[PDB]
Structures are given as structure tokens and as C-alpha cells.
Amino acid sequence: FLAKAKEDFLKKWENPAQNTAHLDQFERIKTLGTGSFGRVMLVKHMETGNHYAMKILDKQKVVKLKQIEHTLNEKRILQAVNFPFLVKLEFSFKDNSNLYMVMEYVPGGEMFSHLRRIGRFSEPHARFYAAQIVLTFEYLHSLDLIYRDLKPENLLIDQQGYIQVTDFGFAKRVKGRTWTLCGTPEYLAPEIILSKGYNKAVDWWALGVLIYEMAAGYPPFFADQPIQIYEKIVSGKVRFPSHFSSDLKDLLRNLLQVDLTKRFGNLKNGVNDIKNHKWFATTDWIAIYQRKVEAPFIPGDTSNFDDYEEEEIRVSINEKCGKEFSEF
Amino acid sequence: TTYADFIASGRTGRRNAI
Ligand SMILES: O=C(N[C@H](CO)Cc1ccccc1)c1ccc(-c2ccncc2)cc1
């Protein structure tokens, strides 16, 4: 499977799709989220009646924040990947002011919203989601991609209750070490905080944080200020809730391992150390991939998304930052 | 409790990237 997937990915990676729609082809309905250099809107493609999520990036804001290369990485990778638990990019294009990525709409909202409301997920519920992340990272890492943005805010729940990973803004295709300080404080591996060259093992550490947060209802390292979070991470002293199973604690001690020669996902057996762990004994990896497992939770409707202030989309009469985004 | 400490913290909302 992975061999065929790499062939498919490389053809798209080497020859990326460009300019596959236009802003006038979509009716903009409502804002689903906002970020430093734009917003995500629910849109309707008038030709088909399909709903999509449109990520709008202001070129000038990307340039001001020195995020050009990361924005080019995001679109180049997202247009090339194909996996059941990844958001599907349908179109991309740009105009004088903005870049646009149009993705299949995932109506269930963020895992973040459901997790905070419910409090915590039971171990079988958390295991169901964690299995999907394990398979997704096995897929991404096999293509030499590092994701670097795992958190419940970036995991969307589809109509079948399965996950769709979004936000490839920090994704990068890299064969060696990399050094960028990026991610979310609670999810940073110690080697990122300590300004070391790091690798895909940072995604496995982030999975450890995610599983802990899903099962506990709070992350393993938190504090009001990021500097305080970093001190807790680099110490790596993790305390587990009394309701955590012995198998769950063993798995987390292996993922939330400061020692790279000991961290699960980063050993000679790679992902198999995770797949074969006792916590995952009840997991049928193939049925998860095939979406045959009954989901523990089933969510143009935007009710599973928070409300955001609307703003008119202004397109300048002059092209901005043309050379910087020529390949988009 | 750790849960009460989390809920009273300023980090329960959507977390921004660094
Ligand atoms: O990348 C995403 N948002 C950034 C924070 O994660 C913020 C941002 C950053 C810069 C510009 C705009 C937004 C994102 C979120 C949701 C969906 C989405 C897909 C499908 N169905 C519903 C929703 C697509 C992309």
C-alpha cells in the first residue's frame, strides 16, 4: 500500500495542480475560523451545489509574518496527499490579494469543541481516534513529511465520526533534520524547545500529548505562560490521572519519552512498537483504515462550529506579492 | 484537583501556534 501511495504522491509533488477554480465560482456563507493571516469560510460551489471549506490567506500578512515558504509547503503537500483521515483539497487558486484552498467540508466541527464540552473521552473512545492518527503519521512519514501541528483544534470529525486532519501550515517534506521553532506550546517535544535539529519523532511525542489530553481532559503540561509549559516539558515528569489504565500509562511513558533512543515511533521497529502495544490490543488496524469500526460518537449546517465576526473579502485592483507566490 | 486547575487556567480555549 505505502509503495503505491508514494508513487501517487511523487507524481503530484513534482507537478502540482494550480489555478483549478476562481473566487466567483463560490457563494461565501459563514466564517468557520480565523488565523493570523486569514480565515476559513463555508462556501457553496454553485456549479455542483457542493459545500466546501475555503481557507483564505492574505498574501501581505503571510509576507509580514515571514511565512511564505511554510504557505508554499502547505499547498504543495496538501494537493499531493491522499489518505482517509486527511482533509481533501479540491481546488486552489489566487488573486491580486489572497491565496485560496478549497477543501471538502467536514460538518462535525473540531475534536477540541467536543472534548472540552464532554470533559474527557473514555479509553476506547480516545483509542479509536488515536488509531487513526497512528495510521495517518505512518502514511505521512513514509512520504518524508513531518506534520508538526497535532492538537484537537486541528482534528475535524466527519459525518461517520472519523477524523480528518487539517492545517498543513507547518507540514514539510524533509529527509534530514530540521530546525524551525513551530507548533503549539503544550504539544512541543523537548528537542524543539531546546533548539536542537529534530525529526519526525516530534509527531510521535505530539501523539503522546494528544492521547493524554483526550483521556484526561487536560494536557500533561499546562500553565498560564508558555515559558512555564516549556519548563514542565523539558523536565518530562508526567503525572497520570488515577483512572488511567496501566497499559495507557505504559504507552504514554514510551511516547512522552525525552530520550530519542527510547521514544516509541523512533526505534528500529518504528510504528510497529505503537501498533503492537497492549493498549492497542483491541484495535483492528485494517478495519480502522477501511472505516468499518463503529464510531463512538456521531455529530451546509455550521452548528458544530463557533460563531465568528464576518468581514467582506476585498480584492485589490493591484497584484500583491506576485513573485513570492508564483508557484502557488 | 488537576481538572479544577486546568479549568481555572488561561489555556482552555483554542491554542495559537507560537
Ligand atoms: O488551517 C486551518 N485553520 C487555521 C488553524 O487551524 C487558521 C487559519 C490560518 C490562516 C488562515 C486561515 C485560517 C483550517 C481549519 C479548518 C478547515 C476546515 C476544513 C474542512 N471543513 C471544515 C473546516 C480548514 C483549514
DSSP, residue by residue, A216-242? HSS-SS--SSHHHHHHHHHH------T
Under 8 Å between Cβ of A104 and A52: yes
Contact between chains at A223 and B18 (C-beta distance less than 8 A): no
Q: Pull the grid cell for residue A305.
A: 462550529
Under 8 Å between Cβ of A111 and A163: yes
Contact between chains at A226 and B15 (C-beta distance less than 8 A): no
Distance A282 CA to ligand 1 centre (A): 33
Residue owning the nearest CA to atom 10 of ligand 1: A35
Angle between helices A201-216 and A123-142 (to 10 degrees): 170
Fold of A1-15+110-299: Transferase(Phosphotransferase); domain 1 (1.10.510)
Under 8 Å between Cβ of A174 and A80: no
Whole-Å CA distances, A199 to A47, A154, A171, A190, A278: 43, 21, 12, 12, 26
Burial of A235 (C-beta count, 10 Å sphere; 0-12/13-18/19+): exposed
- CA dist A138 and A151 (Å) reads 17
Which resolution, in Å, applies to this structure?
1.6
Phi, psi dihedral angles at A265 (to 5 degrees): 100, -30
Q: What angle (nearest 5°) sits at the alpha carbon of residue A285, between those of residues A142 and A120?
A: 100
Closest-lying ligand 1 atom to the alpha carbon of residue A55: 12
Which residues lie closer than 8 Å to A316 by C-beta, 6 or more apart? A96, A97
- CB of A220 within 8 Å of a chain B CB? The answer is no
CATH architecture of the domain formed by A16-109+300-326: 2-Layer Sandwich (3.30)
Q: Where are the alpha helices (DSSP H) in chain A?
A: 2-14, 59-64, 68-78, 111-118, 123-142, 190-193, 201-216, 226-235, 246-255, 272-275, 285-289
Q: Which of A70, A167, A301 to mutate to test the pocket of ligand 1 (most atoms within 8 A of CB)?
A: A167
- CA dist A134 and A86 (Å) reads 12
Query: CA of B8: which chain A residue's CA is closest?
Result: A224
Q: Pull the grid cell for residue B8.
A: 481555572
Dihedral, CA of residue A45, residue A46, residue A49 and residue A55, to nearest 10 = 20
Which residues of chain A form CATH 1.10.510.10? 1-15+110-299
- CA dist B2 and A253 (Å) reads 19
- CA dist A41 and A307 (Å) reads 11
Method: X-ray
Whole-Å CA distances, A178 to A81, A150, A170, A171, A195: 21, 17, 12, 12, 10
Whole-Å CA distances, A219 to A110, A137, A299: 17, 20, 24
- CB of B8 within 8 Å of a chain A CB? The answer is no
Q: Pull the grid cell for residue A63.
A: 509576507
Q: Which residues is A42 bridged to in the sheet?
A: A30, A53
Q: Which of A58, A144, A149, A158 is catalytic?
A: A149
First CA to last CA across chain A, in angstroms? 29
What one-character DSSP code corresponds to residue B17?
P
Q: Is residue A306 annotated as a catalytic residue, yes or no?
A: no
Q: Using CB atoms, which residue from B2, B6, B15 is nearest to A151?
A: B15
What one-character DSSP code corresponds to residue A187?
G
- CA dist A210 and A126 (Å) reads 9
Whole-Å CA distances, A23 to A95, A97, A102, A107, A169: 8, 12, 10, 22, 21
- CB of B3 within 8 Å of a chain A CB? The answer is yes
Whole-Å CA distances, A160 to A40, A87, A183: 22, 14, 29
A15-53 burial, b at 16+ Cβ within 10 Å, e below that, comes to ebeeeebebeebeeeebbbeeebbbbbbbbbeeeeebbb
Ligand 1 pocket by C-beta < 6 Å: which residues?
A 32-33, 35, 37-40, 53, 55, 57, 87, 103, 105-106, 154, 156, 166-167, 169
Neighbours of A174 (CB within 10 A): 14
Q: Long-range pairs for A29-32 at CB < 8 Å and ≥24 separation?
A: A29/A300, A29/A302, A30/A302, A30/A310, A31/A308, A31/A309, A31/A310, A31/A311, A32/A302, A32/A305, A32/A308
Q: Which chain B residues have a beta carbon less than 8 Å from that of A193?
A: none
Which residues of chain A form CATH 3.30.200.20? 16-109+300-326
